[PDB]
C-alpha cells in the first residue's frame, strides 16, 4: 500500500516530464545524448502500457489507474516525431505486440480455463488501441500484401466471425456473457481503426450462410449484424458514399439484410444526432 502507492506516483511523474517539460522544444537531443543509456524508461513505459498491473495499476484504483494511459499516449505522440523514434520501435513491435501471435491468440476464447485463458489478448488490444490514440500503430504493425492490413482482415474472420458461432460442429451455439460480447466488440472496434476493410465487411454482413442449432435456422451474416450492431453501424456511418454504394448497387437477394442495416444506420445516426448535426442529412441524401 504505502511503498506501491508512493512508487506509483513517482514512475508516472518521471514519465510525465519526458513529454511535458522536455520534448516540446525546438531541440532536446542535448539531453537525449546524456540519457542515451535509456532503455529503462522505455521498458517501464511498455510494461506500464501492456501489463499495467506490473507497476502501480496493481492497486486496482479507478481514478488514478484509468488516467495513467493518457500519459503513455501523449508520450508516444511526443516521440512519434522525435528523431529518437526507432528506440521505441525496437521494443513495442518486438516484444508486447509481435505479428503472428495475435492469430495464435484465437485458440482459446470464453473457455473453461477462466483464471488464465484469454486476458493475454485483452492486454494486447488495450495497449494497441492506446497506440492508435498515439498514431504509431500503422508502423507498430508492418504492411501486408493488399491495401487491408492482412493481420487485421484475418483477425476479423479468425478471432470472431469463425469463433462466434460453432456451425461446423453443431454443438449448441452459445448465449453470450457480456464479457465475451464486449471483448468481441473491442476486437471488432480495433479492426475498424485500420483502412481498406469496408469492401470485405459487406460480404460478412450479406453472407447467405444460415446457422443450424434449439433446432430452427437463421442467417449467420444477419446474426453477426444483429449481435455486433453498434461496431458495424458507426463504421458504415463514417464512410457514407462508398458504404451506401455497396448497400444499394452491389447488394443482391438483399431484402432480409439491407432492410435491417438501412434502418439500423438511420436509428444509430438519429441516436448520435445530438452531436451529429450533419451526418443524418448526408446519409439521407446518399440513399
Curated annotation (Swiss-Prot):
Its post-translational modification remark reads: Autophosphorylated at two clusters, the T2609 cluster and the S2056 cluster. Autophosphorylation induces a conformational change that leads to remodeling of the DNA-PK complex, requisite for efficient end processing and DNA repair. S-nitrosylated by GAPDH.
Ranges where the record places region Leucine-zipper: 176-211
Compartments in which it is found: Nucleus; Nucleus, Nucleolus; Cytoplasm, Cytosol
Top-rank taxon: Eukaryota
Query: What are the boundaries of the region Interaction with C1D?
Result: 176-211
**Pathology linked to this chain's protein:** Immunodeficiency 26 with or without neurologic abnormalities: A form of severe combined immunodeficiency characterized by reduced or absent T and B cells, recurrent candidiasis, and lower respiratory tract infections. Some patients show dysmorphic features, severe growth failure, microcephaly, seizures, and impaired neurological functions.
Q: How does it assemble?
A: DNA-PK is a heterotrimer of PRKDC and the Ku dimer (composed of XRCC6/Ku70 and XRCC5/Ku86). Formation of this complex may be promoted by interaction with ILF3. Component of the core long-range non-homologous end joining (NHEJ) complex (also named DNA-PK complex) composed of PRKDC, LIG4, XRCC4, XRCC6/Ku70, XRCC5/Ku86 and NHEJ1/XLF. Additional component of the NHEJ complex includes PAXX. Following autophosphorylation, PRKDC dissociates from DNA. Interacts with DNA-PKcs-interacting protein (KIP) with the region upstream the kinase domain.
Protein family membership: Belongs to the PI3/PI4-kinase family.
Q: What does this protein do?
A: Serine/threonine-protein kinase that acts as a molecular sensor for DNA damage. Involved in DNA non-homologous end joining (NHEJ) required for double-strand break (DSB) repair and V(D)J recombination. Must be bound to DNA to express its catalytic properties. Promotes processing of hairpin DNA structures in V(D)J recombination by activation of the hairpin endonuclease artemis (DCLRE1C). Recruited by XRCC5 and XRCC6 to DNA ends and is required to (1) protect and align broken ends of DNA, thereby preventing their degradation, (2) and sequester the DSB for repair by NHEJ.
Name under which the protein is recorded: DNA-dependent protein kinase catalytic subunit
Q: Which organism is the protein's source?
A: Homo sapiens (Human)
Amino acid at each position: 500500500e504505502r511503498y506501491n502507492y508512493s512508487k506509483c506516483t513517482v514512475v508516472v511523474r518521471i514519465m510525465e516530464f519526458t513529454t511535458t517539460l522536455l520534448n516540446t522544444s525546438p531541440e532536446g537531443w542535448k539531453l537525449l545524448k546524456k540519457d542515451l543509456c535509456n532503455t529503462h524508461l522505455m521498458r517501464v513505459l511498455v510494461q506500464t502500457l501492456c501489463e499495467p498491473a506490473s507497476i502501480g495499476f496493481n492497486i486496482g484504483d479507478v481514478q488514478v489507474m484509468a488516467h495513467l494511459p493518457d500519459v503513455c499516449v501523449n508520450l508516444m505522440k511526443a516521440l512519434k516525431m522525435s528523431p529518437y523514434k526507432d528506440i521505441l520501435e525496437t521494443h513495442l513491435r518486438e516484444k508486447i505486440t509481435a505479428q503472428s501471435i495475435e492469430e495464435l491468440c484465437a485458440v482459446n476464447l470464453y473457455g473453461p480455463d477462466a483464471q488464465v485463458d484469454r486476458s493475454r489478448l485483452a492486454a494486447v488490444v488495450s495497449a494497441c488501441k492506446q497506440l492508435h490514440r498515439a498514431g504509431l500503430l500503422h508502423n507498430i504493425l508492418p504492411s501486408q500484401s493488399t491495401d487491408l492490413h492482412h493481420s487485421v482482415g484475418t483477425e476479423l474472420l479468425s478471432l470472431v466471425y469463425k469463433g462466434i458461432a460453432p456451425g461446423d460442429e453443431r454443438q449448441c451455439l452459445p448465449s453470450l456473457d457480456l464479457s465475451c460480447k464486449q471483448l468481441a466488440s473491442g476486437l471488432l472496434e480495433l479492426a475498424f481503426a485500420f483502412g481498406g476493410l469496408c469492401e470485405r465487411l459487406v460480404s460478412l454482413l450479406l453472407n447467405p450462410a444460415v446457422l443450424s442449432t434449439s433446432v430452427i435456422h437463421f442467417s449467420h451474416g444477419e446474426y453477426f449484424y444483429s449481435l455486433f450492431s453498434e461496431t458495424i453501424n458507426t463504421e458504415l456511418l463514417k464512410n457514407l458514399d462508398l458504404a451506401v454504394l455497396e448497400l444499394m448497387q452491389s447488394s443482391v437477394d438483399n431484402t432480409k439484410m439491407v432492410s435491417a442495416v438501412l434502418n439500423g444506420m438511420l436509428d444509430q445516426s438519429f441516436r448520435e444526432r445530438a452531436n451529429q448535426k450533419h451526418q443524418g442529412l448526408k446519409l439521407a441524401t446518399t440513399i
